[PDB]
């Protein structure tokens, strides 16, 4: 029952635990619900922000009831579940792109992406239509190398057609590039190396500002190291 009502394994074990320790102070900013920066929770803030920018749902009605409570202020349960699923200890930093990939199988697919595979001089070509909540591809219009073709030339994987909304997680280090080279998206998570810690933050393309914790700081997409983007059409 517990595993069918909420849609994930060991659901009975989780729901008996105490979620109060993860009730971070939160506010509403530009309609989005964001978390105040504390206990290195920035990876949780930017992870749940992309779920809001993507307008994603969860497959089971039980998990969505948890996610809906997160957006209304009851952030204790879902935040704990992100630590419980990803296997991260409270107060410790984590990877937001790793969290989104583990969340993908629980999210209803709300979009589509065509990934074209071609080489340096069009020697071998193929197209496929991906329909997943999170797809690991290049956040740039360039693409990434993906091995050799039967002619000894490197493949290139780029997103050419976008339907609906999906989260494209970059396959590599945080990339800085001109804004007009990224895929057309609505929000970009950036990752700054402060010197061995890091700071996660989201860039709202509409307002042209940046979600930083519970505030709204200025930012420039041209100098932001993007790690994943909520691509839309």
């Amino acid at each position: 029952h517990m595993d069918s009502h909420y849609g994930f394994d060991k659901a009975g074990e989780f729901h008996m635990l105490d979620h109060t320790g993860f009730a971070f102070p939160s506010e509403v900013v530009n309609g989005r619900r964001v978390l105040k920066t504390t206990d290195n929770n920035c990876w949780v803030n930017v992870t749940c922000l992309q779920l809001q920018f993507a307008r994603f749902r969860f497959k089971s009605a039980g998990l969505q009831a948890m996610w809906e409570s997160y957006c209304t202020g009851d952030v204790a349960m879902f935040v704990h579940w992100l630590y419980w699923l990803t296997g991260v200890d409270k107060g410790q930093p984590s990877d937001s792109e790793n969290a989104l990939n583990m969340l993908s199988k629980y999210i209803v697919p709300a979009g589509s992406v065509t990934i074209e595979r071609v080489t340096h001089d069009g020697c071998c070509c193929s197209k496929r239509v991906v329909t997943a909540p999170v797809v690991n591809a290049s956040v740039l219009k360039l693409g990434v190398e993906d091995g050799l073709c039967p002619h000894g030339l490197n493949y290139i994987d780029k997103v050419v057609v976008v339907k609906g909304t999906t989260i494209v997680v970059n396959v590599g280090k945080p990339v800085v590039a001109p804004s007009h080279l990224f895929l057309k998206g609505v929000s970009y998570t950036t990752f700054l190396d402060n010197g061995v810690a890091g700071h996660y933050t989201v860039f709202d393309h509409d307002t042209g500002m940046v979600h930083d914790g519970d505030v709204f700081v200025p930012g420039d997409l041209n100098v932001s190291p993007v790690t994943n983007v909520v691509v839309s059409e």
């Binding site: 290195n40 690991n136 091995g147 890091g198």
Partner: protein
């Protein structure tokens, strides 16, 4: 069989694996060659994140396939 793994710098190393091997075994071979602990490793194939508990045959990883390595960020 042999597979290729694109690393952090852009160079491509080759691994000697079996279709019955698990992803944790592939991460152990990357640690044994690049010195990166599997706790900092993320393997992507065909745009999908590879689970630790599954085998290469579960992801239909054929002979001479290419995986992408990306370091886990600490935010």
């Amino acid at each position: 069989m042999q597979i290729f793994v694109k690393t952090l710098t852009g160079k491509t190393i080759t691994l000697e694996v079996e279709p019955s091997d698990t992803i944790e075994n592939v991460k152990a071979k990357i640690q044994d060659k690049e010195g990166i602990p599997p706790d900092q490793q993320r393997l992507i194939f065909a745009g999908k994140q590879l689970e630790d508990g599954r085998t290469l045959s579960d992801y239909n990883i054929q002979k001479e396939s290419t995986l992408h390595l990306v370091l886990r960020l600490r935010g």
